[model samples]
Target chain A: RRGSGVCGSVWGQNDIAYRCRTCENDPTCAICVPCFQNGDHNSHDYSIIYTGGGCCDCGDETAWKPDGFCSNHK
Target chain B: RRGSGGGVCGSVWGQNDIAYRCRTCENDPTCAICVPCFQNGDHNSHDYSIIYTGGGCCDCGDETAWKPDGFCSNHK
Candidate 1:
């Protein structure tokens, strides 16, 4: 959970390219494709990160503030 | 009222990109007539006017036809 390893939470080897929009305040919200599609964000509005390129702090509110995407979430 | 003037099907003049607007929706000048949106019963019975952007087809025959900004407000 501290490195760039593929999200092994769902579908096993998924890329951590997405974040949770439904539960914006959850400490463990930073997620991947499978986690986003696994009912966690089924009831919220999510935006795709495409400006920065790096690891997204999905749990820290400030990281996702205003843009929902971390500063390095390109 | 028929020779490339404008209508529910919009126009095909300059840019050949012409469209229609729903007068009743208060969306004139912006809302192009998305033929399918109307046909799909989204704007049935609504009055429409020709909106010719000047020189382009609505691409209604292509996938762009479904784009709200391209023709109506139902698509992106």
Candidate 2:
């Protein structure tokens, strides 16, 4: 299943927001630490964009790619 | 959140469990799975197939598909 992407994603139980440095073309592109540690994105570089109670504003069209959590999915 | 692709089997230390990768996702680098997940009103229509590798501790019968690596919102 394709995930909810950045907007719907969180860290270690929805605690933080992440962005993969290698996946810049896709704004909704999000990943968890566990996924990175467990080979899901093995060798793929990324960063933590933010943390706490808020999530990425996936609704911002200009801030994301042509295909993302806000545009391509619910 | 994306998982380790290691499902919870009866194994004592979460080891000795089987892991599956969807065939339809061969083009992608990595694929995820939950064998029964595909047949239960899931992505069965996506024409997904599976390839499992591990200690063969669990079998959901049908082969299926993962995490941040293209895991559908509904299914993940």
Task: Pick the lDDT winner.
Answer: 2
DockQ scores of the candidates: 0.02, 0.05
lDDT of 2 by residue, B1-76 (tens): 2223322111111233334445544334233344443333244435454543332222121122222233333233
Candidate 2 docks with a DockQ of 0.05
Stretches > 4 Å off in candidate 1? A1-74, B1-14, B26-28, B42-44, B55-76
Among all windows of 10 consecutive residues in model 1 chain B, the one with the lowest summed lDDT is: B1-10
What's model 2's lDDT at B8? 19
Residues A1-74, model 1: lDDT tens digits: 11121222221122234544554554223444433454334456665532212222333343233334322333
Q: What lDDT score goes with residue B37 in model 1? A: 41
How do the residues B6-61 of candidate 1 rate in per-residue lDDT, one tens digit apiece? 11232233444444555555322333443454444355565666554544223221
